[model samples]
Each structure stands twice: as C-alpha cells, then as structure tokens.
Target: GKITFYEDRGFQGRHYECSTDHSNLQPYFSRCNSVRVDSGCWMLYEQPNFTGCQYFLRRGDYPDYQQWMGFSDSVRSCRLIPHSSSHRIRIYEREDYRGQMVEITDDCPHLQDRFHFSDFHSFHVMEGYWVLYEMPNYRGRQYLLRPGEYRRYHDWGAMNARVGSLRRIMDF
Candidate 1:
C-alpha cells in the first residue's frame, strides 16, 4: 500500500487585539506555508526552507480580512462574522496551503496519522459574562469561553452551549 504524508508550518495567534464589545473587535491576519512527505514516523520534524514567512495587515476586521497569494487576478481573503447569541460558524479555505507534510504511525491500533498545522491569530471582545460551546461537527467535546479566555483555531473549530454540571461554572 502507498501512503502519503503532509506537514504544515505557519503562524497561529499573534496577539491581534483586545476589546470589551463584540461589535468593536479587530482583525488579525496570518500566512501559512507547508510541506509534504511520502513516508515518516509519528514524530515531530523541522520544516524545509522556512524563510520568507512574514505578516501583512489585511483590510477590515477578523471576519472581513482579505488574502493575497500572488496568483490569479481575483482577490482572496477570509471574512468571519459573529451572530448574536449564535453558537456556530463555518470557514472555508479558498486556497490550500502549499508544501504541507504528513506522517504516519502504526504504533497504536486506532491512531495512525499526524500533521503540522497553523493559522492566523484572532481575538474576540467581550467581558464579564462567560460562554460555552462545542466544536462544530465534533462528537463530544465542550469549550468554555470565559473572561480572559484566549485561543486560536487553524482550520475550523466550533463551540456550543454547555450542559449539566459544566454549566455551573458560570452560575450567577
């Protein structure tokens, strides 16, 4: 059997901004570079030609930032929006990152794949009240976004309202 491996090295959150209101949030943009491998073990490895990586300010806010890849005549970028009291959002990549690398492992009976990924930084402006949600399409995982909570998502991550005892964490 022939198996392919891929790896990616790029920027994740880089301290974009902070705010106290969702309507007054800022946008952060990042670039991604990747590499691919044919065969490898389940371990971390450095990327090749890791130079020429830089950050550029995209016009607009987090959900309205544009991207330029030096190709095609049309402009490319990502636009994210927060729905009031909404629990889910969707993201699509117009262009797949280049040179991503991947690795395969046979150590575990259920685990067999690994890859390197990265994404641009972003931030939400909110204070006091806490929020909880699940990663969209995820089976059984919950995340709590409280005051001072910060995180970065590479591809597409979602959140849903918490249930049961987990809700007690935000009891007022």
Candidate 2:
C-alpha cells in the first residue's frame, strides 16, 4: 500500500491503496484503524508473475526444516517472500495426504537440500476447512499478506487453502 501524507496548517494525514501501479488504482481512504477490501490484497510484485501468494518460510532446526511466515487474518492468506532456495521446495496441503503416514523422500524436483521425516510431522484439517500440520520443534513468526504492505490479522485459516494447493503440485 502507498502512503500519502496531507498537510492542513500543521496537521498531517495519510492514506493507502490496494494498487501501487500508479496508473488506474485509487487510494482507499479510511479513518478506522484499518480498512478491508473485496479484491485480493497485494503483496510484493515480482517478475514472471506480477501477483504473488502471501506465505513464507524460514530455516528452523532441522537440516531442511522451515516454518511458514506471514501475518494472521480471519479471511486472508499470509504473504510469502522469496527465499534463497525457495524455488526448490514444494508446498503441500492436508487433504492430499489425509489418513496416511508416509515418508517424504527426495521425490519432488523442487525439494530443497533439507528433508522432514514423515513420522516427525502430521497434517490435520483445522475447523474442517483450514489445513494445519504439526511441525516438531517448529518455531517462527507469522504475518498477514497485504497490498503494498504487511498487515497482521487474527485469522490463520485463510491461508490454508492457498498453501494447500501449493503443497499438492510441489510435494510428491
């Protein structure tokens, strides 16, 4: 989101928007602590794909272990950032591997140098909608994915559906 400052005498005001293209996008004005939009929020615009998903992971204890990072929201997905070896890791959802205990081998072409023992973690669908998996000794920060900015929300399940799809295609 772009912040614009307004000055009247000595006071200053700011505004934000969902688009940073600086073309046809309009700034959303609000006096509330925050503003909500209908269109999907924007994160960092990158090459290959102008729009990106709001989800991220950081290296943890295990060799290839990493924790997903992003802001919390009741109805939004967490914004993701690019990592050094992110291109090689595959993301997965809970539904695809439900009711099954299996090993995660180097089956995925995008699998990074690290690997997680299948038995060490388990996937569960939260509230019958959001997918959540247990990460052993997993510790990290989370944030919400917002347009042109990073905003935190109270919902975690909003990101599950999107991330789940990523896991299916990337995870073998």
Candidate 3:
C-alpha cells in the first residue's frame, strides 16, 4: 500500500510517502494535515508505535484532518494492512473466547440486530483484518483488528467492549 502525508492541509507543505509500516514518523514531518492513499488500506495513529487514536483509510484522498475524522493533526505513526483473501472473525460474549460465540464473515451494520447484543467481550480474528465501530452503520471511533486472539476488548485497543458494528478491512 502507498500513502502520503502532508504537513499542511490541501496536500501542501512538506510531504512524505510511505509504503510500509512506519513506527515513528516524527522525523518525516512535524505534523499531518492531509493524506493521500494511492493504494491498499491503512491505519493512521495519533501516537508512535501504532498507539493512541486510530483511523482507517483506503485508496482515496483526504484533503484535511477532518476528512478522516481525526481528533487533531498529530499523525505520528501508520500501518499498511496486508491484503487478505478471506475474512472471518469470532466474537465472544465473555472474555477469553468464553460465553456466547458468533462467527462473522461479512460486514455487520448492526451487531445487536443479528447477535442480540451490541457489546462483545472478546474476539478471535480467524482470518483477515476487521474494524470495530462504536456505533451502528459503520460510524464512530474505529479500532483495527488484525488476525489474532483478543482475550479482552482492551487487547484490540478499545477502551470499552461496546461494538455496535464491524467491517472487514479490504480494498474493495
């Protein structure tokens, strides 16, 4: 995946192009006000080492920070999500993959409508990457989920377990 970060809005000021996971982008630019995703999916982070607020981006143009629903123009790190041939994930009502379990392979606009619950305590990403949304219809804060077992919501970098909706991460 290819992504470019601009120091100022409207693709102005100094810019840096990245094609792989970047741990510390502080040296590339002082601040980020705009972005251009030439290909593949990406997760932009407000802090270095892939920590803090996360925003998912696809092949597109973001003229300003608000375009990506950013809290500020302080992008310090980024990750280029690898492409996956399939998508699958298991949600657990309780931690450690315990309690009620549900397997999901497609986008869920409303988790409660199908699972009868909105909050999932744990997750097992069996296949591809996914994004957990705080609200339904793919809205609200986003938490990127790479393939792995999450014993708790915090493991996915979520402050809470309230997942109203979910979407598989892909280029399509």
Candidate 4:
C-alpha cells in the first residue's frame, strides 16, 4: 500500500511518497497538508515514532489537513494497517486477559462508557485485526491489533490503558 503526503493543500507543492511504514517522517516534509492514500488503510501519528494522537485513514484522497483526520496538520509518523480475515477480538480490563472481558467481531462505537469499565489493560486478538481507541466513539489514541496477546498498554502499541472503542476492518 502507498500513502503520499503533501506540504500544501489540494495535493500541491512539495511532497513525500511513502510506500512503507515510517517511524518518523519529520525531515521528509515537516508537516502534512494533504494526503493521498492509494490503497489499504493507514494510521497517522501526530508525534514521531508512532506516538501521540492517532488517526485512521482509508484509501482515498485527503485534499487538506481537515480531510486527513489531523490536528494542526502536524504529522510525525505513519504505518499501514495490514489486511486480515476473521476479526474476532477479546478485550480484558486488566493485564494478561485477567479482568472484565468483552468479546465480539464487530464495530463497537463507545467501549469505555459502556464496555463494563473505563479502560482495558490487556487485549487478545483471537482471529484477525482490530483498531482500538483511547476515547469513546472512536476518538483519541488508536492501537492496531493483529492476532496476538497484548499483556499491557504498550504491548498493544498504545501509550495508555484507556481503550474506549473498537472496530474490525470489513473485508472488501
């Protein structure tokens, strides 16, 4: 998959093309004024090394920063969301899947306000891929989960334990 970034709106001016995961994209363009997601899904980070606020972007053209799910257009890093099949995900409220649990294979809009607890410390992606959020209604920090065991916050690639929502990538 390829995701291109531009330093000006309407896909004009200096640009940088990225077809692979970039832990830090600072010197490349400084800021992302627009984006063109050629294929697949991608996660853009506001801070370098995949830190700070995260945004999920699908295949499309984001002619401006607002259309690209960004904050002040300060893009520091990016990674592709690997495609997968069968999205059965399990979320636990404590480390090592040893707390309150919620299992499903569909999109959950608001997990913290309704998923038995305010945060989940552990996660088990049993069958496929998933996107977990740090705030309700799919807002805030995001952590991508492939089939595996995440014993803690960083284990799932997040900065905290406040997982508030979930969504499974629909096969197309």
> Model 3: per-residue lDDT, tens digit, 20-90?
99999999998999999999899999999999989999999999998988989999999989898899999
Give the lDDT ranking, best first: 3, 4, 2, 1
Model 1, residue 128: distance off in Å is 2.2
Better of 2 and 3 by lDDT: 3
Name the 10 consecutive residues with the lowest summed lDDT in model 3.
111-120
Spell out the clash pairs found in candidate 4: none
Cα lDDT tens digits for candidate 4, 1-172: 8889999899998899898889989889988889898887887888899877777788889998777446678889987877776788887878988868988888889876666666578878888777787777777666777778988988866666676778886432
What TM-score does structure 3 among the candidates reach? 0.94
Model 2, span 16-122: residue lDDT tens: 43323332212332221222222322222111132222333222111111112322211121222221111222223234343333333222222222334222112
* Backbone clash total, candidate 3: 0
Runs off by more than 4 Å, candidate 2: 1-14, 21-32, 44-88, 91-140, 143-172
Model 1, position 52, has a per-residue lDDT of 18
Q: What would the TM-score be for candidate 4 when compared with the true structure?
A: 0.81
Using TM-score, rank the candidates from best to worst.
3, 4, 2, 1
Greater TM-score among 3 and 4 belongs to: 3
Alpha-carbon error at 85 in model 2, in Å?
A: 22
**Tens digit per residue, CA lDDT, model 1, 120-160:** 12223243222222222211232333333233422113332
Candidate RMSDs in order: 20.2, 15.9, 1.3, 2.6
